[PDB]
Amino acid sequence: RKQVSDGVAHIHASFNNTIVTITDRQGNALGWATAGGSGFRGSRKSTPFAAQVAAERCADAVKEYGIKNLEVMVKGPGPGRESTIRALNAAGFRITNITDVTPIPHNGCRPPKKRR
């Protein structure tokens, strides 16, 4: 519905999982899909290929909106940081730009302890 012509793709990668959310420039979600949500529960949801499977799933189920242009905003340096956007173009999108947004503080809050 509303046949949105161009959209945005947020990749929220992490050391444990990957979430793909497709939006528009207004910041309103259309569909989401995660590696853990794609049946890869366990230690396999952090694999780079596990992000490949999820990216196609979110590329699908937004075909109702007829999205033809995507802007990729990668976040959260982790395993699924570049593979998950190889699958985005394989779904037929015409990526206009790729931007890396990620929280880099200027020495803000104190991080947790070292692990032992």
């Binding site: 890869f40 230690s43 396999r44 694999t47 780079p48 290929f49």
Partner: protein, 151 residues
């Protein structure tokens, strides 16, 4: 072999048909080290399979292998608490030998009378794309795509 590269000694192509591939079949099937019983069982079983369905005695038996060859197989590497299998391709030389073994081990599990009869039935199913041989090939294929994220 830590430091050894091997070359397998050649074997005699079989007299009846001249296929060295079939000569391996009698070697795999042979038990307790004797070829007189094993060779005749293979030859006799091939007659029934050829008579039952299609000509080209060798080609009917070659169709079965074309259906049971596995194109991928997992191997395990231990890292932490538990080992996880990693898929890897199968070299064509070992690919022939793997399905060549699976048919015989599956044949010895039928309830028929003669080992020749059990071998003929199993080869019939494999050529018809059915039976225990392709089922064994199906598991290694399914369990290699089950965890393909590893490499």
């Amino acid at each position: 072999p830590r430091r050894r590269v091997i070359g397998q000694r050649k074997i005699l192509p079989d007299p009846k048909f001249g296929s060295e591939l079939l000569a391996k079949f009698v070697n795999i099937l042979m038990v307790d080290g004797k070829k007189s019983t094993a060779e005749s069982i293979v030859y006799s079983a091939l007659e029934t399979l050829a008579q039952r369905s299609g000509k080209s005695e060798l080609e009917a038996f070659e169709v079965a292998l074309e259906n049971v060859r596995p194109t991928v197989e997992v191997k395990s590497r231990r890292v932490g608490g538990s080992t996880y299998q990693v898929p890897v391709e199968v070299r064509p030389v070992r690919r022939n030998a793997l399905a060549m073994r699976w048919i015989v081990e599956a044949a010895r599990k039928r309830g028929d009378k003669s080992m020749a009869l059990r071998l003929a039935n199993e080869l019939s199913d494999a050529a018809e794309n059915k039976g225990t041989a392709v089922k064994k090939r199906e598991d290694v294929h399914r369990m290699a795509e089950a965890n393909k994220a590893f490499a």
